[PDB]
Amino acid sequence: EQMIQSVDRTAVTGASYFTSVDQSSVHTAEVGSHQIEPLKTSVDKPGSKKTQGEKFFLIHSARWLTTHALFHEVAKLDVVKLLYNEQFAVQGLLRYHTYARFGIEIQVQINPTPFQQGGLICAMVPGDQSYGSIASLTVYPHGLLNCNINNVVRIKVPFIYTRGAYHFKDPQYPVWELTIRVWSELNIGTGTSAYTSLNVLARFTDLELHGLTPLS
Amino acid sequence: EQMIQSVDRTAVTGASYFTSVDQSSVHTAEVGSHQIEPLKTSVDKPGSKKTQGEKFFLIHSARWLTTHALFHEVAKLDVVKLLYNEQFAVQGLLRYHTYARFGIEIQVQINPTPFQQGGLICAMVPGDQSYGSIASLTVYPHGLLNCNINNVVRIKVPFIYTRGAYHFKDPQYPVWELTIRVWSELNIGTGTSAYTSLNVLARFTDLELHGLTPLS
Amino acid sequence: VQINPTPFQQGGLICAMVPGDQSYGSIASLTVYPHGLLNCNINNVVRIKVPFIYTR
Amino acid sequence: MMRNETRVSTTENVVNLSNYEDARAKMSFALDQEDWKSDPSQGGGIKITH
Amino acid sequence: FTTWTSIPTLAAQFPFNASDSVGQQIKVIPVDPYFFQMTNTNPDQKCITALASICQMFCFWRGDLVFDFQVFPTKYHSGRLLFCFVPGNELIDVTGITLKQATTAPCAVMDIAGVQSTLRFRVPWISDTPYRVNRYTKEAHQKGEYTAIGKLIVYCYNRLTSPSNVAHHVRVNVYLSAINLECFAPLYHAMDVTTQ
Amino acid sequence: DDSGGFSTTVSTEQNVPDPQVGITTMRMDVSGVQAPVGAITTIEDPVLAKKVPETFPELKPGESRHTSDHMSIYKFMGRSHFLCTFTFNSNNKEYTFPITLSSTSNPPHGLPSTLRWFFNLFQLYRGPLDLTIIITGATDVDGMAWFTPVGLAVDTPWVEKESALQIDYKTALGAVRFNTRRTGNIQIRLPWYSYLYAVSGALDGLGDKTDSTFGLVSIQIANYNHSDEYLSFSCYLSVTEQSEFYFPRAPLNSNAMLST
Amino acid sequence: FLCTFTFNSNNKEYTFPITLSSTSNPPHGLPSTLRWFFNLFQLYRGPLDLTIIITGATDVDGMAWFTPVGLAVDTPWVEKESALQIDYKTALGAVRFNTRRTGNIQIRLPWYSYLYAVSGALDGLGDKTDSTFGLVSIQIANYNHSDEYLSFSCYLSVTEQSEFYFPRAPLNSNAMLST
């Protein structure tokens, strides 16, 4: 009397989101094993979500002149919408998913010559540039530029929204709205250059994705 | 005598791959904290590389007839090249990176009526369909279809290549080459349908990325 | 070595002690020798100490 | 089954004269390979080596 | 031989004018230890780096390279540069990359003024083959064998704002050295000035 | 599980490398009284495919008489084989032949009879070799041979012509020196100097001209000639214990096996 | 590689010095690889390792000897008659070889010099004094019968007894010449 072992047919096999329920299956026949490389051909750490999703991106720039009056708005941009573009590396994850929950890091860079004078303001505003006073923008999380002291500010903010998550392919209303106002006017003399450039850097923090979709 | 604490200026701050070396910085001023949701608005686990990268994809199909002769090649496809396309969700990670090292899972599905007879063969071949004998394809990791026994086979293979990693935007030569041959001819009678469909499923295993590039 | 720039100017120098000869060695690689770099932004005095190198 | 193989290297059959290790002989005219002892009987003990 | 290779020597030279727009590409660098472009007239000679006169005698090379950028400003200029590294080989089409498109690649910024004046930039090893061949002995091209791991781009991230009684350009020297270097398979070959 | 999936049906390990010692030896009936469960089976199950079959009452064969085994690669291919042969015609004519593992390059330019069959049974080759040459013909001829890795400047392959490289570039790579009157044989190693991981046998496209060749041997002669006697060389290869082999492959058909 | 030369008639003595100068352009001096190597540093000290290869005719008797610097010897790089007697040659130590039997000599070279160490790159009168440390000469006999060329070659090396001092800036592209 013997006992003949047979093939396995009905089980839950496959990937996580692709459940292959089969009435007929076979044992996996594959040779070898995963060898390590003692003489490595790439000395950098391999790619993942941590090294691709959270990385500073140049999304928009402006330029600050001497002829802009008081309280003029230099740059008015949507932070979330400009990140969603093919030219950045974060497109490869957000294109195939639907909902997301995230935080925003902002970095602003300018370069004054020490012959000039003036200042700016960079405040992250949620939802709307509504009827709130321009003179009280310092209640918002902001940073003050000044041609005497410093040329780089940075802002970190949590997630403030009225729903569960953001929807990329059909947005309700923009979550964050960055704004840059002329806090004091720019004054030069004779022969001093009448402009300085501006830059805005941005990245996500704590990106969480849900519900991958097949549609492009 | 007092000691006046001041602002921090020179440090390594920012994201991992964006090192913001600044001679002037400020302490981060941001309010609130990360709250959890006791009444959740999404009951699925959030997105990551594990739920987006490794998932079965339908990449190519063919159809098996009665008029195909012996040893005819039904489908001849490149496994790696067909995965690299915008219509899948794995494009969002591979578009912004350069090198990758990976393994391949294959699933083949057919559907015979029990009035027919015949069989197929599905062998994963590395590199080339070179001068090797067709009669000895069973040395390769393969799976045998049969209209009497079973209709689903699956193959798992490790990484076999002559370099460190694969290069998407400029491939050297295709790593894997799937092939499907007519192992025995298809025979019907009168009124039995003279065809059956075929499908090929595929996904990655152990995806590792290196060296993100800015170019599209 | 001592120099004195006004802060309206810009530029730099190099002061390398060379034994024996100013032979066919490249000018672009004088930093292999014991040297010191002057700069009108940073510093105006450099100093070099060397041992005895000779064939007799 | 004897197995002894030696590769013949370069500088074959070359006479060196500079040092003593290559200037010395390989065979002798003398019978029975004999050697001579010391005899300071007529020199008065004066022997020169430097 | 590492007594020569681990010491930085001057390789390249480029100015930073005050009349460039934001996103203008200043200088491209192929990443290899074979790169050098300086020369002199009296006497007639083609200058060499210390790193190029070690690796010109080997068929293969491997390891991380260290670029050192040294600026020479006054105390009163201001502006920011953006160094970017694109992985690849010595021939791709690289000037179509816009300034926003360069942030996908690994990059770093530099502030001109301050008390520091040197940026040490360590390039990682990104390749598909373990060793990268020397090809400059040969004459024809062939797809698959190369001499580089990619190229480097120098952008203008912020403009040069300055007073009137100072100059209008800041010159930058480019050094060159290596770390964790490995070569084998000796030969003889004399290099030639890469004219970029 | 690493991927977090699920599987109940298994496709097991396939084509186990080096399964059995090829000498007929022992480690009483082998088959017998018990009813054969291995007589009937299903070949489409990879689990049930590795069961040892029996149908008839058998027993142990015994032990062979010759000591060493002839079914191991390192003792089979330890015997040398043929690679190529060529002649000279005039003075200072340099010759160059590459070692090419391509299945496309038909002989005489490529691998002949035995070595063409052997190096297409597997995918990847890695490691050094062992080269022996035999001088046949005239005497009083001075020669010099050197080795050049791939991806470097060297003369054209398979073309007997003048020398186009100086004496400094030749001797820097390391060379030998021999006279046809004294020795008549050179038994030389060949190093493994290549930037890529391992060369491969059967490829197409541009992968064949890049990833096949790993070595390149050239021979220059001097003091030839006096009154015309043919100077014929031959070249014989081998394999060494440092070398490795990877990924077994389907063998060649009858039409690929050509000869000289 | 170091050098190569031929003979033409009977009893013609030849002499070549080992010179570490950067001024003496090849063929008279260091060729391609050795010219590049011995100018990467300042001071060299210690013995060498010399191999020569006889190519060409047979049945030729030869003799080679070594002379330190600062002593009387024939003119360098000039194939001419012998000007020294047999007593002065064999006192310095010599070898003996026949071209039919061996065809190779693998010989050491001693370090016999009054000064501390020779140097690579100098000018003025320091180049003609402090560069050369050795001097090798070869005399042939029984040449000839019906004219066959007798070509020699000379190959150098380095030994573990030798030393190196004071790293130096490498040569430019124009100094690296070849044969």
Author numbering:
A (entry chain B), B (entry chain B): 5 to 220
C (entry chain B): 112 to 167
D (entry chain C): 1 to 50
E (entry chain C): 51 to 246
F (entry chain A): 3 to 29, 40 to 272
G (entry chain A): 94 to 272
From the paper:
report the characterization of 4 highly potent NAbs: F4, F6, F7, and F9. The structures of these 5 complexes are almost indistinguishable. that these NAbs prevent HAV attachment to the permissive 2BS cell surface. binds to the BC loop of VP2 and the BC loop of VP3.
of HAV by F4, F6, F7, F9, and R10. regions of light chains and heavy chains of F4, F6, F7, F9, and R10.
